[model samples]
Target: FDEFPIGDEQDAGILTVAGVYFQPVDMEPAGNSLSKNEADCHMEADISANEKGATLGYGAGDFVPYLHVKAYIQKVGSSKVQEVAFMPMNASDGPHYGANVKFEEGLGKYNIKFEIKAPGNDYLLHVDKETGVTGRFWTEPIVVEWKDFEWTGPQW
Candidate 1:
């Protein structure tokens, strides 16, 4: 089930959180548009956003769509931080949310976070009087953290 170990996870009611870091691979079509020599590795996140849905999917929670995800990383005991913009991407790991990061320090402990917000209001929600959907996505950002993560470096 879980192949990526250099990461963290948290379940925040509406969704389960997962964040991973690993060597970069072939992300096709756009290709190098996302991959660059400067990027040390790929930082990814997985969310099982099934509040009330069916069983099994690649995400293992029936897949929730249209979410705004923001990823961030920081070296432990440091003041500087890197804000990563994760895209909706597909790879050998299947469809995932991730981005390339320049781990310039390399092979050190770090802290990672994924801040998530709900989908847009224009995404179409039924608002009828009776039998209408009275629910909405998260009003606050769902944050997941990976603390004191040790890595072997990008080549690994």
Candidate 2:
């Protein structure tokens, strides 16, 4: 979790500091949800409160050059909701940027919200907050493979 101070700063037309706070979550294990491969895929965590937590990341190499995080809240019954998004945290070669977000402390039911996108395509991972876990990565529904065989001297 990260924290930033918001002082008497005027709104800068386009880029302005409206609010500042912290975000936190309590991550735990979800029921019967175990992965024989990825261990990070078997936990039910909740963003309970925030001393200051947000979707943040940096470039790892020539692969993921940028990262961003967004959150959306939907009421169970009422039509009250909220949303927030960040474009780019940093611009560099590898692991060179990060963003700070804030969460509130209270009692309510809210779903986890976030999306990952690159310069080409975008991947969306959704999960239920009631389980306190992040969503899983997307996989292909079908796969195809081929094999080849040869003999030393097939003259028969």
Candidate 3:
């Protein structure tokens, strides 16, 4: 994919971001596990310079210019999904970004989600400029299982 700047340092440029959300994996120790297993999701963005500063704009109330980005996860076949999460990604930074989500009781097939918006002088624009961008991907089905723990007579 192409690269685009995401933050104030890189001229408020464009970005090519992509990712996938995977199904929750089985936690070790089986039935004795303290918490639900977590699914790994990752995003990669190609940040390219915008020397003209054409895409730069102030945030909600801040004077400093920046590019805004948001990400989240969803179940592929069903409507179940998580709340959207926002981040102020840096344009001059590397191309890798990711996160992990804990397995819920009823999560299905998983997919990644993303939203990129350019800041305006007074407000943020709702229109998406990254057309044809591949922002989401499907993952394995969510699975959780318990193993029978056996105990032997203990000797002091």
Candidate 4:
């Protein structure tokens, strides 16, 4: 539930971003195929940036940091999509951060994309100090299929 750290001119270093998609375990069964249970889903990312062996922190404290990585999900060939941001590095002491995203956009197919960008500052660009840079990695189109289910009233 924290804001992802975005990039800015003040940041000068090597940035690495990694992410993954996970299935929600607590989702309840919907009555029918057309409906889905209200459950919390997450998109997680592990990010780290360093300059001259010094890891970059958002800022002093009490102020939201501007450095971050971003993720986008959209239908194939469709412009409409959902954007999710990874929390700032300083948000917690853990190496990985995640955001709760609603998967209730209805059933369909989507493509996920990840990028590193600087908000409020266009002059700064984060680069991978190591090899393996591919203009922001993107996942192949993923399909979500819904199965027909008998309508059963809530037992509770």
> Which portions of model 4 miss their true places by more than 4 Å?
1-13, 23-40, 50-66, 89-93, 104-108, 119-156
Q: After superposition, how far is residue 99 of candidate 2 from its true place, in Å?
A: 6.4
Number of colliding residue pairs in each model: 0, 18, 6, 5
Angstrom error at residue 149, model 1:
1.2
In candidate 2, position 148 carries an lDDT of 21
Q: What tens-digit string does per-residue lDDT give for candidate 3 at 77-133?
A: 546656443333322333333233443323344444344444435343434556332
**In model 4, how large is the Cα lDDT of residue 70?**
58
Candidate 1 lDDT, 5-37, residue by residue in tens: 655467775677777767765565545325656
TM-score of each: 0.79, 0.27, 0.34, 0.40
Q: Which model is ahead, 1 or 4, in terms of TM-score?
A: 1
lDDT of 4: 0.40
**RMSD, each candidate, Å?**
3.8, 23.7, 15.8, 13.3
All candidates' lDDT scores?
A: 0.67, 0.26, 0.32, 0.40
TM-score (C-alpha) between model 2 and the true structure: 0.27
- Could you say which candidate leads in TM-score? 1
Residue-level lDDT tens digits of model 4 in 1-156 = 332222211322344444443432222232211122343344555545533223322222222234445566565556676666655432234545455455434445555555554444523335566633223222332112112311122212
Which candidate number would show the highest lDDT if scored against the true structure?
Answer: 1
Off by over 4 Å in 3: 1-14, 20-65, 89-100, 103-108, 122-156
